[PDB]
């Protein structure tokens, strides 16, 4: 079995840019939010970029930030489906173009 | 021994999609749940996808969500064996077909 | 940067996912008093210790252990992927064997042998 | 195990150590109200955000930032390797530039460019 | 830049088997122990093996376990220098021979 | 994209051995220390070696240990610039020459 030294640094990636269009009651309940609208879910690396993603999403009409987590690199936000989708697009486009991030497709459930 | 720089990012994978058909008493007690029915257990990466899997499980079948853990990337839920298996199948199908995630088989004990 | 350039250190992206493995399935036949005290358990019998990946499989291993033999579960830890349980040596070994056989034969996970101290 | 054998998945030992890198040196010029609220800071000025490895270098970056320009440190986090600070846009950019130049030129760390939103 | 999927599992290794022969006061103070004797320090992977190492060390004459940490994979114990050294040797020999661990030399400060 | 199994173990490395010669007030305040003298900062792997580095630092020179963190693998200490530099030098020499660890230069700001 070969052995190597791995110098570990964070990559630059959005691994999830997702809208739950019509969450079930239990999902609203676990976030502690109003049981209305869609939920956007973002996974980012490095984790500090959560605050940047939350700032992009929360600037848009109809978007309320549910939480910004710099410890896990996660953002969740609420809005109508169309607002949530375009804010996910704003995040993907900013991070791809400006920070050279690897990105995933916008996904929907 | 050589040295390489590793840019660490989360992968996109379900590593466990499991039903315990007839849990022992100690296992119901560790989850704090009613001592009836089957338990479904899911391991996901990136961890934020736990909320997506919980939403699919609750919409797929008459199950009770035990917890949704975005910190560990884990979901557990309860219901009759058929209901829990339906929920696991719907998670695995959606994550594979719609998210392009790596998946595992639906496993049973 | 300078360290990387002058060291000619290469760079790769690694997508991290958990593997599927039992890395420890161990019986302490006759624990010392301090080990029983650290688990907060009765100072009698053997202790079984299991290390699993991914960590959520701890609850599956605990269920098999308790169904396999007359053991008392000490803890089931889905945060660390760990299970510990207690009982007479033969019961603890039976439970460890049943965990290894299920994970190897039904799940196809990588498994270590049963080890004893 | 069966999954590994039939998938012909190879196995390597990786000795994990931290690298030496700034992965983020970023100014939010005009934060939204919710971002100021999440940091618990005055709702005025730009925010600077730094991601460092190894995480203990957060205190070094905070010291440079505060010495470089009239900024207010929001937090210094040696557990996550993170620094955030606030001030007028030109002060926040000066502090980020001074962090990048010190880490690149004095320490030889890998560094990203200064980024703006 | 190449990209690979890393299936992460714990290795089997003792990375540290160390005796501080005559700790300074501050080191005794940080462990909350009597300011006498040497300190043995063990780093193990997987972390659950801390309990096995603590059982081997604590069985020996003169050894008191300071702490056993299954969350970090760490053990610290106290005794006279010679007892601490032979207990570190007992741990290294058990884990190398029985569990096939990679091991380091016994080190001393 | 190919897949490999990575057996993860800690490496043996000091990644930071740093003196802040004249800290700003906010930095003394974040550590909760007297606003006088230099600060030494050490990053170690495996994390248990923090206690070994703290012991060497305290025995090397007239320094005050701020914290010894075996959870993060970190040590910080305070003293006059000469004392702090002596302590960092003794840590780097011992870890390189006696433990066979990878080290970094003694760095200054």
Curated annotation (Swiss-Prot), chains C, D:
InterPro entries: BMC_dom, CcmK-like_sf, EutS/PduU/CutR
UniProt cross-references to SMART domains, sorted A to Z: BMC
Primary localisation category: other
Keyword entries, A-Z: Bacterial microcompartment, Transport
Disulphide linkage map: none
Cellular component, GO, one term: bacterial microcompartment
Positions in coiled-coil regions: none
Compartment(s) of residence: Bacterial microcompartment
Pathway: Amine and polyamine metabolism; choline degradation
Domain spans labelled BMC circularly permuted: 11-109
Pfam family name, one: BMC
Annotated function: A minor shell protein of the choline degradation-specific bacterial microcompartment (BMC). Proteins such as this one with circularly permuted BMC domains may play a key role in conferring heterogeneity and flexibility in this BMC.
Domain free text: One side of the hexamer is concave and lined by hydrophobic residues, the other side has a slightly protruding, 6-stranded beta-barrel.
Family as reported in the entry's similarity comment: Belongs to the EutS/PduU family.
Assembly and interaction partners: Has been crystallized in 5 structures (all are mutated, 3 have an N-terminal His-tag), most are homohexameric with a central pore. In two the homohexamer lies flat with a beta-barrel on the flat face created by the protruding N termini of the six chains. In 2 others the hexamer is not flat but has a six-fold screw axis; the screw pitch is 33.8 or 41.9 Angstroms depending on the structure. Interacts with the BMC major shell protein.
Name by which UniProt lists this protein: Bacterial microcompartment shell protein CutR
Organism in which the protein naturally occurs: Streptococcus intermedius (strain ATCC 27335 / DSM 20573 / CCUG 32759 / CIP 103248 / JCM 12996 / LMG 17840 / NCTC 11324 / SK54 / 1877)
């Amino acid at each position: 079995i070969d052995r190597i030294i791995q110098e570990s640094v964070p990559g630059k990636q959005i691994t999830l840019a997702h809208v739950i269009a019509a969450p079930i009651e239990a999902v609203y309940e676990c976030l502690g939010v109003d049981h209305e609208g869609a939920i956007g879910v973002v996974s980012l690396t490095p984790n500090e970029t959560a605050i940047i993603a939350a700032d992009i999403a929360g600037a848009a009409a109809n978007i309320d930030i549910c939480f910004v987590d710099r410890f896990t690199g996660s953002v969740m936000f609420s809005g109508d489906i169309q607002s949530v989708e375009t804010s996910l697009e704003d995040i993907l486009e900013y991070f791809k173009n400006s920070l050279g991030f690897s990105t995933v497709p916008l996904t929907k459930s």
